[PDB]
Amino acid sequence: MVLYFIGLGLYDERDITVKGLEIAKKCDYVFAEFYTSLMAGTTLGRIQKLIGKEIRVLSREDVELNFENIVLPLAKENDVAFLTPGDPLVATTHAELRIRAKRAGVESYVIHAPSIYSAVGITGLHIYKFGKSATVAYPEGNWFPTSYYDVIKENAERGLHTLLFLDIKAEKRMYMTANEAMELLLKVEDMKKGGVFTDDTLVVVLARAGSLNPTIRAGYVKDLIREDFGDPPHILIVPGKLHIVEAEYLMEIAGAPREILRVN
Amino acid sequence: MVLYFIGLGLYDERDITVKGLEIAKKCDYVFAEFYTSLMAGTTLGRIQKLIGKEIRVLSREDVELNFENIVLPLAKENDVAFLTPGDPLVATTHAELRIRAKRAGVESYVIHAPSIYSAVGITGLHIYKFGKSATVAYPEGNWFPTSYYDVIKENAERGLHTLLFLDIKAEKRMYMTANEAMELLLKVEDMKKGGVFTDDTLVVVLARAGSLNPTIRAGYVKDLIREDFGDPPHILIVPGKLHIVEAEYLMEIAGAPREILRVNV
Numbered sequence: 001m002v003l004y005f006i007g008l009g010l011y012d013e014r015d016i017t018v019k020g021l022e023i024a025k026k027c028d029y030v031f032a033e034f035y036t037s038l039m040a041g042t043t044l045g046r047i048q049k050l051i052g053k054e055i056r057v058l059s060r061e062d063v064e065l066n067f068e069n070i071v072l073p074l075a076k077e078n079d080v081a082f083l084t085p086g087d088p089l090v091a092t093t094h095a096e097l098r099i100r101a102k103r104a105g106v107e108s109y110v111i112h113a114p115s116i117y118s119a120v121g122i123t124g125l126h127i128y129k130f131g132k133s134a135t136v137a138y139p140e141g142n143w144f145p146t147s148y149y150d151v152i153k154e155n156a157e158r159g160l161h162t163l164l165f166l167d168i169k170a171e172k173r174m175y176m177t178a179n180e181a182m183e184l185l186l187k188v189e190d191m192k193k194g195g196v197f198t199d200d201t202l203v204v205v206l207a208r209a210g211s212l213n214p215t216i217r218a219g220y221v222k223d224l225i226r227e228d229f230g231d232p233p234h235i236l237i238v239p240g241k242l243h244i245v246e247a248e249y250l251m252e253i254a255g256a257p258r259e260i261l262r263v264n
Numbered sequence: 265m266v267l268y269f270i271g272l273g274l275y276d277e278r279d280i281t282v283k284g285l286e287i288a289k290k291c292d293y294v295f296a297e298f299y300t301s302l303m304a305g306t307t308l309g310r311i312q313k314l315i316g317k318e319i320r321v322l323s324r325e326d327v328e329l330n331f332e333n334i335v336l337p338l339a340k341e342n343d344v345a346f347l348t349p350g351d352p353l354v355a356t357t358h359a360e361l362r363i364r365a366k367r368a369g370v371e372s373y374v375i376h377a378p379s380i381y382s383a384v385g386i387t388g389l390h391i392y393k394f395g396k397s398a399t400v401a402y403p404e405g406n407w408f409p410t411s412y413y414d415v416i417k418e419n420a421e422r423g424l425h426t427l428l429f430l431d432i433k434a435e436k437r438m439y440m441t442a443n444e445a446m447e448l449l450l451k452v453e454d455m456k457k458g459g460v461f462t463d464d465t466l467v468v469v470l471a472r473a474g475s476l477n478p479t480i481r482a483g484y485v486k487d488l489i490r491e492d493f494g495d496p497p498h499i500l501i502v503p504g505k506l507h508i509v510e511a512e513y514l515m516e517i518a519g520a521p522r523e524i525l526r527v528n529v
């Protein structure tokens with residue numbers, strides 16, 4: 001008679017917490033969505049095998065328009081689990097689903113999992129120094145999103161790092177690469193000319209966090225724009241003012257150029 | 265012949281990931297530290313029982329001063345694990361530990377787990393709206409730090425939420441409760457009078473994140489400052505202007521007063 005929102009983690013089926021696994025295995029029905037992010041190191045089959053249940057995957061429309069018609073009805077008479085990549089509530093609108101659950105008289109519980117939001121720690125950038133985050137969205141038709149550019153500007157003025165979630169078109173199997181994000185940002189700069197993102201801007205790329213060998217690279221846009229960072233998912237980060245120890249990590253672990261040491 | 269930084273997660277022994285547990289079980293030596301934070305929903309004994317290996321606890325000095333003499337040497341001929349509450353490398357100084365490993369010729373890998381940085385999502389506050397984070401520290405002697413108050417001011421001014429970690433003295437096991445944090449912030453407000461943190465400020469308190477039964481409470485300082493949020497540690501958040509959906513979540517899930525719909529949105 002309850003609903004569990006359970007995160008599956010960053011890259012593969014084993015990124016689920018022990019808590020999440022033991023609970024999922026005992027749920028009567030298991031639902032999931034894989035449109036909010038990409039778990040590049042696993043498959044629906046491997047996940048089902050792990051928890052030993054058949055998983056009904058839902059589309060964004062199924063969730064946003066019919067969560068209360070598809071999932072909640074079963075939660076009224078059974079224990080139901082709703083799985084999501086990473087942490088279920090981070091950079092999604094799933095939190096709102098708990099309100100729906102309540103209205104339907106269904107108690108809900110959240111089981112966290114490693115999220116890209118904290119995995120940024122592996123870039124060596126102090127996590128407390130990150131400011132407002134944003135998402136680089138694919139332009140659509142004549143509509144060209146640019147608010148994310150202003151976020152970078154605002155954080156940079158404060159010396160804070162900016163985390164940029166990258167766009168995803170799950171149904172089209174399209175996952176935005178850090179390269180595509182950089183290209184878009186350069187075009188926005190050419191339009192706004194705020195000196196926010198140029199060929200000389202230091203950026204950090206984190207690809208496939210959660211995997212054993214994620215790609216962690218740092219350097220100037222002019223040098224990374226055409227670099228191959230491997231398969232998606234990717235996140236792009238625009239550091240603010242660096243502490244010496246952050247720069248040292250970027251240099252020795254992420255291959256950044258020695259010049260970034262002159263933080264002042 | 266490798267070092268694994270493995271996160272223990274949020275609250276109890278089941279907050280480690282399947283990957284983290286399986287790797288820890290394959291390591292010849294397993295170390296851990298609980299000075300950055302504690303695992304309040306479990307005990308060292310339960311964690312050791314789960315992993316099935318003796319766990320050697322290291323002090324702040326053992327780590328900061330002698331990581332290369334205690335942990336790294338063993339990675340030359342063995343697989344070693346270094347367990348930390350939350351997600352590895354989140355604590356400010358831990359990333360440098362990877363640099364030490366590399367400089368010492370030791371390959372290292374990071375196995376992630378849930379962190380409070382992402383788990384605060386359960387407050388219903390949009391993660392992208394969080395700005396710079398800070399820690400509320402106790403004043404000592406002739407030193408009265410107030411930077412955390414300025415962080416709140418700068419974030420709120422830009423419509424951003426502020427995640428506030430509360431002072432902790434692991435060894436002594438002395439915690440600053442959310443109540444104590446509010447009292448301190450009010451004192452700072454009286455000093456700077458910037459209109460940043462007052463009796464009318466809306467705040468959110470999160471305790472025992474990770475547990476199946478966390479305490480999530482939202483309301484004005486005047487009403488929550490003397491409320492009992494249960495056992496520490498507590499996390500304090502000062503939201504910036506709210507999206508109506510965030511407000512509705514705080515009301516339905518965190519018991520916030522309906523007044524926030526007309527005052528903080």
Ligand SMILES: Nc1ncnc2c1ncn2[C@@H]1O[C@H](CSCC[C@H](N)C(=O)O)[C@@H](O)[C@H]1O
Pocket residue numbers: 010011036037038085086087088089090091092114115116117164165166167168206207208209210233234235382
């Ligand atoms: N393992 C990973 N490596 C790199 N980027 C990742 C990632 N997982 C998610 N992302 C980034 O975040 C975007 C999804 S946003 C949803 C995030 C998810 N709830 C979480 O907690 O992680 C992706 O398009 C990508 O830009």
Ligand code: NA
Pocket residue numbers: 127128130131394395396397
């Ligand atoms: Na943050």
